[PDB]
Every structure is written in C-alpha cells, then in structure tokens.
Write an enzyme that holds these catalytic residues in place. Structure first.
Site, PDB file in Angstrom:
ATOM      1  N   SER A  47     -21.114  23.290 -32.037  1.00  0.00           N
ATOM      2  CA  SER A  47     -19.991  22.917 -32.485  1.00  0.00           C
ATOM      3  C   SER A  47     -19.410  21.554 -32.142  1.00  0.00           C
ATOM      4  O   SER A  47     -18.425  20.999 -32.586  1.00  0.00           O
ATOM      5  CB  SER A  47     -18.558  23.600 -31.991  1.00  0.00           C
ATOM      6  N   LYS A 204     -14.961  17.710 -26.112  1.00  0.00           N
ATOM      7  CA  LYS A 204     -15.257  18.695 -27.289  1.00  0.00           C
ATOM      8  C   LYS A 204     -16.467  19.365 -26.732  1.00  0.00           C
ATOM      9  O   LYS A 204     -17.650  18.823 -26.363  1.00  0.00           O
ATOM     10  CB  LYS A 204     -15.426  18.036 -28.690  1.00  0.00           C
ATOM     11  N   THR A 205     -16.430  20.913 -27.098  1.00  0.00           N
ATOM     12  CA  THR A 205     -17.561  21.643 -26.428  1.00  0.00           C
ATOM     13  C   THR A 205     -18.396  22.111 -27.854  1.00  0.00           C
ATOM     14  O   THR A 205     -17.970  22.019 -29.018  1.00  0.00           O
ATOM     15  CB  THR A 205     -16.924  22.916 -26.053  1.00  0.00           C
ATOM     16  N   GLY A 206     -19.697  22.829 -27.468  1.00  0.00           N
ATOM     17  CA  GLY A 206     -20.383  23.305 -28.416  1.00  0.00           C
ATOM     18  C   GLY A 206     -20.934  24.376 -27.782  1.00  0.00           C
ATOM     19  O   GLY A 206     -21.194  24.363 -26.583  1.00  0.00           O
TER      20      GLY A 206
HETATM   21  C1  CAZ Z   1     -19.447  26.027 -31.973  1.00  0.00           C
HETATM   22  O1  CAZ Z   1     -20.149  25.769 -31.164  1.00  0.00           O
HETATM   23  C2  CAZ Z   1     -19.136  27.527 -32.439  1.00  0.00           C
HETATM   24  N1  CAZ Z   1     -20.002  28.222 -32.067  1.00  0.00           N
HETATM   25  C3  CAZ Z   1     -20.647  29.291 -32.992  1.00  0.00           C
HETATM   26  O2  CAZ Z   1     -19.847  29.421 -33.886  1.00  0.00           O
HETATM   27  C4  CAZ Z   1     -21.845  29.988 -32.470  1.00  0.00           C
HETATM   28  N2  CAZ Z   1     -21.814  30.973 -31.636  1.00  0.00           N
HETATM   29  O3  CAZ Z   1     -20.478  31.619 -31.448  1.00  0.00           O
HETATM   30  C5  CAZ Z   1     -20.630  32.451 -30.590  1.00  0.00           C
HETATM   31  C6  CAZ Z   1     -19.232  33.077 -30.254  1.00  0.00           C
HETATM   32  C7  CAZ Z   1     -20.955  32.002 -28.935  1.00  0.00           C
HETATM   33  C8  CAZ Z   1     -21.773  33.592 -30.956  1.00  0.00           C
HETATM   34  O4  CAZ Z   1     -22.739  33.924 -30.114  1.00  0.00           O
HETATM   35  O5  CAZ Z   1     -21.587  33.777 -32.240  1.00  0.00           O
HETATM   36  C9  CAZ Z   1     -23.218  29.490 -32.985  1.00  0.00           C
HETATM   37  C10 CAZ Z   1     -24.309  30.077 -32.759  1.00  0.00           C
HETATM   38  S1  CAZ Z   1     -25.562  29.092 -33.577  1.00  0.00           S
HETATM   39  C11 CAZ Z   1     -24.462  27.702 -33.975  1.00  0.00           C
HETATM   40  N3  CAZ Z   1     -24.884  26.523 -34.785  1.00  0.00           N
HETATM   41  N4  CAZ Z   1     -23.091  28.264 -33.703  1.00  0.00           N
HETATM   42  C12 CAZ Z   1     -17.396  27.611 -31.818  1.00  0.00           C
HETATM   43  N5  CAZ Z   1     -17.535  26.748 -30.639  1.00  0.00           N
HETATM   44  C13 CAZ Z   1     -17.265  27.215 -29.568  1.00  0.00           C
HETATM   45  C14 CAZ Z   1     -17.502  25.884 -28.226  1.00  0.00           C
HETATM   46  O6  CAZ Z   1     -17.916  26.101 -27.321  1.00  0.00           O
HETATM   47  O7  CAZ Z   1     -16.607  24.805 -28.635  1.00  0.00           O
HETATM   48  C15 CAZ Z   1     -17.223  28.510 -28.847  1.00  0.00           C
HETATM   49  C16 CAZ Z   1     -17.103  28.740 -27.563  1.00  0.00           C
HETATM   50  C17 CAZ Z   1     -18.089  29.498 -29.913  1.00  0.00           C
HETATM   51  S2  CAZ Z   1     -17.422  29.314 -31.614  1.00  0.00           S
END
Ligand code: CAZ
Length: 258
Positions: A47, A204-206
């Site tokens: 993200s 900003k995190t991901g």
């Molecule tokens: C961005 O990084 C978003 N991440 C996701 O949508 C994904 N996984 O979300 C979780 C909840 C961890 C899951 O296991 O489904 C994902 C998997 S592969 C990909 N390209 N994205 C949101 N952003 C954050 C953040 O850290 O900013 C989150 C905590 C999870 S939602």
C-alpha cells in the site's frame, strides 16, 4: 559515497533474525549523510504507493481547479476488503481530498482504487513518479521476485524528500501532503515506534499479506536539526517489530540521538 554508512550498524544480523530480507535507506537532509542496506533492491510496494498517489492528486490539483473538492460517488462493487473509511460513506460519496486522506491515513483500499482511476491508472501514477525524476518506481496493477509493483528503499526516500521537502509540489500542496502523512494512523508500531514522541513525523505504511512483507516510509523532524527521510521495506520469510528495529538502527547510523 563518502558520507554513506559512516557508522556500521548490524542490519545483517537483524535480517537473519527476521528470516526474510530487509531494505533500508535513510538520509540526513542537513549533512547529506546516509545509511543504506539493500537500498537499491526492489521490494513490493504494497500500500505504500498510496502516499505517492495522494501527492500525484495534489500535483494534478495545481492544474485542475476544484479537483480536491469534487464529490465521488461509488457503488458497493468498489468496496474491496480493508476499506474502513469509504465503506462508511458508500451512500453519500466522498470528496477527492477525503479519499486521498483515507488512502494515506487508514490505507483505505477502495479509496486508492478510485483515485488511481482519476490519474489514468498505474501507468499514470508511474508517469508522475517519472516526472519527478524517479526511474525506479513501477506500479503495474489495478511469481517469485516479481518486479511488478515494486520500488527500492532509496528511490522511495529520494522521491519522498522531493515531494515533502523539495520543490516537486507547490508550497500549499506540499504542506497538505505533509499534513496527510502526519495524520497517518496505521504506523504506530513501525518507524514512529523508533521516533521520540516530541518529534514530528509523517509516514505511509504497506502490508502485503500476513507473512512479513511490509514497509513504511517517513519524514521525521527531530527538534533542533534538519529533517531525516527514510524508508524500510521487507520481504517475508518463506515484521512490525523488525521495521521499528531497522528504523532505530538507521537513526543510530546517522548519529541522531533519540
Ligand atoms: C496495503 O498495503 C493494504 N494491504 C492489503 O490490501 C494486503 N493485505 O492486507 C492484509 C489485511 C494484510 C491481508 O492479509 O489481506 C495485500 C496483500 S498483497 C497486496 N499487494 N496487498 C492495506 N494497507 C495496510 C498498511 O499497512 O498500510 C494494512 C495494514 C493492510 S490493508
């Protein structure tokens, strides 16, 4: 090179303990000193692209009057998982600025998709990054070692510096970008956990899945000195604690007392 990794820090051991890969780049904007560990390797953006997306929206708003206040209505089909803000405004709509803040500060997934549409999709966001001199960033989507949807810690840090502290945005938009990052709610266990409470910080995190691929980038304003820009990216062992630990090592490698 002369000011890079002046002080060695045990990133390799931290990485071994973690079991995956970690990448770190940090710059002291006052001295030019840097800390760099796997800094030019590609890591999944997850993200973290959404911060740059919000900046691209702000850049567009410099040319398109009324963009930020434009109301955007969307259907239920737009509400993908992890859309905590946009799901509450399904029946009302949200403005472009509100979608941007939700994407940045809650990592709202639906909000990011709606904004990507405004810019002409992944290639449009990639084009914005090229326009500020970032030749590494690539967003591809709407495989082991897949290069799609990746950048490097270094390029992320350099672009973040240009957008938040340099001239890539006009001053009002620059301050709005900084304010959005300062209000992020999803990073309290990452870079912020390594930063004293009395220092300002925007980030900003991901997070890609649950297995340890995760990241954070931030601007940090220690009191009494120039800001620090840094990025920490990981690839899962085949992590929130590891990101904070790596940020601590980066600050220590810059000589920044916390
Ligand atoms: C961005 O990084 C978003 N991440 C996701 O949508 C994904 N996984 O979300 C979780 C909840 C961890 C899951 O296991 O489904 C994902 C998997 S592969 C990909 N390209 N994205 C949101 N952003 C954050 C953040 O850290 O900013 C989150 C905590 C999870 S939602």
């Amino acid at each position: 090179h002369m000011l890079t990794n002046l002080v060695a820090e045990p990133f390799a051991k931290l990485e071994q303990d973690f079991g995956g890969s970690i990448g770190v780049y940090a710059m002291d904007t006052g001295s030019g000193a840097t800390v760099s560990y796997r800094a030019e390797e590609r890591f999944p953006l997850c993200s973290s692209f959404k911060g740059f997306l919000a900046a691209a929206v702000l850049a567009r708003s410099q040319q398109q009057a009324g963009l930020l206040d434009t109301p955007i209505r969307y259907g239920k089909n737009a509400l993908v998982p992890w859309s905590p803000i946009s799901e509450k405004y399904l029946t009302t709509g949200m403005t472009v600025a509100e979608l941007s803040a939700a994407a940045v500060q809650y990592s709202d997934n639906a909000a990011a998709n709606l904004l990507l549409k405004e810019l002409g999709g992944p290639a449009g966001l990639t084009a914005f990054m090229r326009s500020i001199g970032d030749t590494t960033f690539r967003l591809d989507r709407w495989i082991p070692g897949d290069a799609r949807d990746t950048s490097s810690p270094r390029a992320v840090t350099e672009s973040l510096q240009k957008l938040t502290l340099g001239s890539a945005l006009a001053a009002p938009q620059r301050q709005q970008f900084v304010d959005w990052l300062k209000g992020n709610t999803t990073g309290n266990h990452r870079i912020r956990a390594a930063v004293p409470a009395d220092w300002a910080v925007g980030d900003k995190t991901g997070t890609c899945g649950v297995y340890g691929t995760a990241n954070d980038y931030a601007v940090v304003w220690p009191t009494g000195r120039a800001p620090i820009v840094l990025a920490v990216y990981t690839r899962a062992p085949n992590s929130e604690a590891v990101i904070a630990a790596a940020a601590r090592l980066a600050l220590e490698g810059l000589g920044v007392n916390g």
